[PDB]
Amino acid sequence: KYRREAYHRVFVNRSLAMEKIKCFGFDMDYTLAVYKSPEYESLGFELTVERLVSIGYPQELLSFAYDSTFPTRGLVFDTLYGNLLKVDAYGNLLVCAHGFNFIRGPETREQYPNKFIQRDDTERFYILNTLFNLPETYLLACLVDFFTNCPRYTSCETGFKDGDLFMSYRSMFQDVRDAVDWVHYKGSLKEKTVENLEKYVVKDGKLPLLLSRMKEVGKVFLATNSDYKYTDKIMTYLFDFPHGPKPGSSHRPWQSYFDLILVDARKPLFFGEGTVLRQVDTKTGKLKIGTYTGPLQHGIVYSGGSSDTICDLLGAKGKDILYIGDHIFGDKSKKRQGWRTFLVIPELAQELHVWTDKSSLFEELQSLDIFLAELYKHLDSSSNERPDISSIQRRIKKVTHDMDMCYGMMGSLFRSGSRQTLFASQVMRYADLYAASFINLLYYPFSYLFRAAHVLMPHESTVEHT
Amino acid sequence: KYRREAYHRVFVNRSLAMEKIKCFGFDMDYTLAVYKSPEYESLGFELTVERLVSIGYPQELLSFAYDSTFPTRGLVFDTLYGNLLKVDAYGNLLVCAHGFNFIRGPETREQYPNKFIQRDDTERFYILNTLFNLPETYLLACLVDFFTNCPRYTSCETGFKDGDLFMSYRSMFQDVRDAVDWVHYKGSLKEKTVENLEKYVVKDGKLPLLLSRMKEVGKVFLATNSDYKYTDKIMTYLFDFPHGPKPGSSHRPWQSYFDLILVDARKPLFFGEGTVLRQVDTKTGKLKIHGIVYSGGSSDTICDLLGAKGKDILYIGDHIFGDRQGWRTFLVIPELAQELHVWTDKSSLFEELQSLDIFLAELYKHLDSSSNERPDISSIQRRIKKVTHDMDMCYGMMGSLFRSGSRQTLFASQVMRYADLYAASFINLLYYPFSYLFRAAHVLMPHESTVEH
């Protein structure tokens, strides 16, 4: 089976015929504009901490340093017990860290009977899905750790006491949640970023190449939650090369690359009723009092609206639209037709790296497993042998832990041992296509037919056809 | 990697060390007592139909014949539009049949825009999970087909009119659901079964062998939703061989193979608050106002009485439940034997599809976003569609219980959720030692399965 090389690959959950794609839609933040790691995370982490201290948190916080090897995306915060939880598709605990203490094993059941959380309880548990939640993920584990080991504060089941003031893990998390928000919305994250774009934002000469090739076979639009003043600063940088689409061609502005540009979308509300469609005034940045209810005829920039507006303006409907982005929405659904989805998952490059330069650890595990099969090979329910496998067992735990440590300290984004993460299952739900970058579409023709990979059940994967 | 034979295998979702199991718990109906197919299904189908007619349904119903090649387990009935839906793990439609007309293609979006349903809407959709829903699965498609194509009746979006008497499918479905229930609780399904046990119920000389070996290494209990009178008749037949545990050994009675026997359990409530524990009088069959045999109670009662904790108990059964500590689970899935058969006696169809797929990879091999080539692959496409269609038909007309095309069924996902272990019959434990350690198979994401080290 011919397969393109791993770093260039688009992966398929649900089959998609590209020939039938009429529009390519793009998310900006963390899609078109990939923020540099760990630079950008650290910046958010710093501004958030500074925001917390200024509104009254201890000053020891001022000396925390974002550590990129702790968090993985998709962890669950238990606001009742203050834990960071890695869980599987169904709610089973995989990892449970209180501060920097990984609680593990039997001592879990005193707080999680059946090692299980009822994920539906969107009041107790908060899923940290987005790449913007990386800073607050590490930060939460920091605060819990700080307050736990600080003598001026008394540790309790659900929070901490100081005097006759109590600070629940729920309240602290709200402070944190509110701090990040503020930093993105009133704080200096945006300006600190644009003041030093080459430190924070990746740029790639194939980006214009791809989008211009895309525009030759179908329409292309931009639908971002950011505002125009910011989008502009960003989109200008992403396109600032001494050339245009290819080396040798003259530099065109980034607006030229889009049949439709929309900002202030307010996704996810966008995909439902949305907001009123308005039009931005490029000179001032403010909105025009009137809009332009007319058809596609572009030097125009839109604000707000709805996904249906896009479909009206480009004269397409959902199944003909490929939406490209970093964020996992939900449902699929509600009576209007929905777009197909290409999910960008940046962590995928490191994930794939481990899956290759650590071949040695997999074939040990392979062989260790082979070896067990043998120890039990000629046995059945009549036999009384209790073969000692406790030496083999503990060896497995070390090779997998050593493998885990390669990802980060909360392990792989997708897997832990045999089990898939809740994240892995959200991806396989929401995403038709996925890859490390959307740029990988450069290595496939627009006539390509993406065929879904077969996810096999145990009885499928361990049983041969002949 | 050494692997036992396919029909003998226990399959693993979550790893389990059998060494650390203290008790084996057993479901009776469709677990210990496997009803013969298609005989039993047919019996239920008839008894159900006759009940419907007795309470006013047309007499044309009386001439339906249960057809075991139509239904598969785990289908979803839409009471709004009257469709049987095969959907995937997340709610995407795979198959949509109205009566016996299989709708899907573009014309699906007229009723399911986005080809998608919300399982959440228990008011609208009903998942037919259990082996007892097999008759009514077929019956539902029969009635919709009948009323739809009978000139005495005019078809509507959400039901049918008799004159301008209107019957919603929601109302019809409830009648059908109520008829089955009636048949099991007030009807003659149980007695017609015990009156002909060899016609309706499988029996295996290995059942005593397993349960006795199990009792040598741990406690064994029976926790069934049936009553004692039925259980007695059923458990007696199941153990009625001229020998005991093994050939040559004297016949022991079936109560002797169980440290604890419990009936009238009322699962799923059993696993929650349960009921008041009562004690059965064997002689009378009635309840009283060690020497074994309880009624009602709760899963805690079991744990108290045998002195076990949740994680030390392997519960064996055919039913997929939901979710104070909980048991490990061995799920029995009878269809698996036939499911595995197709996966084996059809190697030729799989390696065609394989080969057919390879071929595509070539046609696009040296291409990228600069290429202008649109290679015509429609003969390949149409060929692929036919081979998978032929492959489906081997399963039944609603296709495989677990998968359809590239996708897993909602049923498959429930298994991978609820079951630690699963196999075709629990008897396959006969082929593994009680020191065995079951290691979970890795379910791979696309980027894992299509990328080598």
Add this chain to the structure above:
Amino acid sequence: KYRREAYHRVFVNRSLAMEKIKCFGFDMDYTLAVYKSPEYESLGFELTVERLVSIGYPQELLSFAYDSTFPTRGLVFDTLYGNLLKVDAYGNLLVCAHGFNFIRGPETREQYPNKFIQRDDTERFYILNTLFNLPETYLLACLVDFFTNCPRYTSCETGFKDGDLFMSYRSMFQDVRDAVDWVHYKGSLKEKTVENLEKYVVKDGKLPLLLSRMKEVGKVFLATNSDYKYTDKIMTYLFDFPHGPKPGSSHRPWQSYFDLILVDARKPLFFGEGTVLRQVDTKTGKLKIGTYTGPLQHGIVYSGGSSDTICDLLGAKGKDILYIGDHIFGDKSKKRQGWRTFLVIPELAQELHVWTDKSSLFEELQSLDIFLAELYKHLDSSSNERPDISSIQRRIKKVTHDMDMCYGMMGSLFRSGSRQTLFASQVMRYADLYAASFINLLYYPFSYLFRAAHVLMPHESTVEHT
């Protein structure tokens, strides 16, 4: 039947036994703190207009002047056709004004077939219920009027054109909606108010009298959506008299008058899940990082939380609580027990005035109606008389119009001719008690039993018992 005098009366929709009331809860804005009319409305109207122009609206707007005799509360804006609608309990049009043009009669059915709106369509129609919507009510009728009669703009069914820009009535209204919000939230309404409190805010020496008498028989709390810095400035002023509860008693601070003080409630969310309960730091104004999960022991000020929190802290539940306020919420409902309601309706004083000093117009109408009864008295279906009543008819229209003009130009808040307004019906739904001011509770004992008045159907009111 002994009845207290009209200006002092509390009116009853649903009976209430006051003896069984354990807590009095208070809204601040437009309840405890009554803003002066038309002073305050005008101020909002000015700041809103100035906000609109600054973001690009025509400058002619700068010369509008809030006219207090136009708006009534509870009108409905049709964002599709740009109309202000006065409707009845069921959706029937009573008044329909496009700009300052009252469309009236038969010409209504071209836009409203059956003279009826489907009130449920919370996408098309927007109810202007709150006393804060008075400025924008008049302003909307102004803009529609301005744009209609201005030659640079082309009037259309659903908006206006300028060039190839279109401004729908929906978009304009959103601008307006957003402008008011901004003015309350980022603008200078709050500061302009506190800089001149005696111009904007009523103060009354019986306010402390009532609340202190209330505190002798049950607990009293404050639950406002405003923040502490503002509440303080306001509550201080409301209580700034040279004395305390009565003349002769020493001045106590306003906090002393409340068993519980809560700000930032975020009503209506408050009455549901609410927010996390936090505690305000009086010195700084900011929130304490920790709270105080302890029982009622007061020098404390709370922020956020939920209505249940109040019930926990005061150890009461809903039917034992009388909530006093200016805003009409909804449903009754959701499984927690709900408080009883005293609705403050300031306009009630003018409403009652007309109902008294215009006795002359009612007894004319009385007599004119009497007179008809006679013209038809000795007739039945056999008789062929077509008595000319067209002189009498048109006389009625003038006396009722002259009566209407006494209220404002959109008429009575509650009534029009025979019909009740949608507002009247919202009051009778949500309010157990109502009056012009909550201060009227001063004239009733805490042992008083409020007996609901009987709202009679036609066959009840026009048929005697003997």
Add this chain to the structure above:
Amino acid sequence: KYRREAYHRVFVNRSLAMEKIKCFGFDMDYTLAVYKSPEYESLGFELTVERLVSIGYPQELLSFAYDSTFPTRGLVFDTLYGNLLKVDAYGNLLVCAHGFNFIRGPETREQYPNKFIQRDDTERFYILNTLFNLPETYLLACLVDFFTNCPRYTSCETGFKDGDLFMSYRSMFQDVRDAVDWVHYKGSLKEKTVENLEKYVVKDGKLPLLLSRMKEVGKVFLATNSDYKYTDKIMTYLFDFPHGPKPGSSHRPWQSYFDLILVDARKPLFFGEGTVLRQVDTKTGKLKIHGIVYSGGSSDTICDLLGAKGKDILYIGDHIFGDRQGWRTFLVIPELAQELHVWTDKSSLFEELQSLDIFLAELYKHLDSSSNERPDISSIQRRIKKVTHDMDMCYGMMGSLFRSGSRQTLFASQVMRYADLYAASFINLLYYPFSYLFRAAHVLMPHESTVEH
């Protein structure tokens, strides 16, 4: 103010100038043809019960007897808890009866916290609006009472068990609803009625008088949901007197009193898209593949054919509908005669309550927020409660159709919404000229009714 006599009065919600009316439209069932009470209700009750038994309900049902003093119209059935609810205009509980046990007091909040329901939840609650729901109103309270108090059955929050066969009230209610429907559409209600018209249907020598006077000043049409065969039999009886319009005049046939006759109308759909207009053959009774008599069609069809516009049409009927121009409405409410009777033959009870209320006003007269007085008024309270209770009982056991205590019913509010005019019988139009101008009564808010000029 001159006012005609109470039993003769037309009451006005929205003003209407009769002078400007071009057409009179007539509903037949329970409008033109008023069925006798309690005879007709009882007939429906029996036929319904017998249907239920035939499809499997206990035989104890066969000995129920319709009791006309229990139900009033406009009650709300809660299919979740099995309660009959009398609620006010906004959803507040007034009366709550489970079987024949009237629950309300504090013990209501255990099921209705805030003593409140959301009418919005058509999935849970069913408003029993029509005069045809009177039998099933009583029947529903009978069944709940029976299953609740019968030892063969165990009571649950949402239903009852027969053994551990479970029946939700939702399911029961649908059966009851379906039984009534069946009885009207496939059952023998119609034929048992026409076989004894003098027992079941009122007739008035004034019906021709009115309709003929109406035809002298405007068009008259008949728009009924019944078929021609039934309508014929019914309309013939209604007009069967030895004279015509007045005594002395020769008998004209009933078709002659109508410019347009329409059957099989399918209201409410009639008022929307309706159906295809068809034409009836009088001779055959069947449909054909001026001289009058249509089937189906739409309200526009009426307007087209008579050349009228919506606002020019007075539609006369017993049914409260909802909501391309619309008709004015005369709503017939038979119960109004008895409702008005109590409001008159019980002056003594009203002026006691009056007086009792006056008395309270005195006890608090010279009091204010400074007073320490807590005057004991509990004997007055308890006396008030009894007098209103006695007053209720005059209506029935669910009290007045329109009000209960100070509050208006949900039924009363629907009337004030849907009806421009209402009266006990449409015959009361006989007492007003066609030049009459109906002026709406003013419904007053508390501050209006308790404050004089």
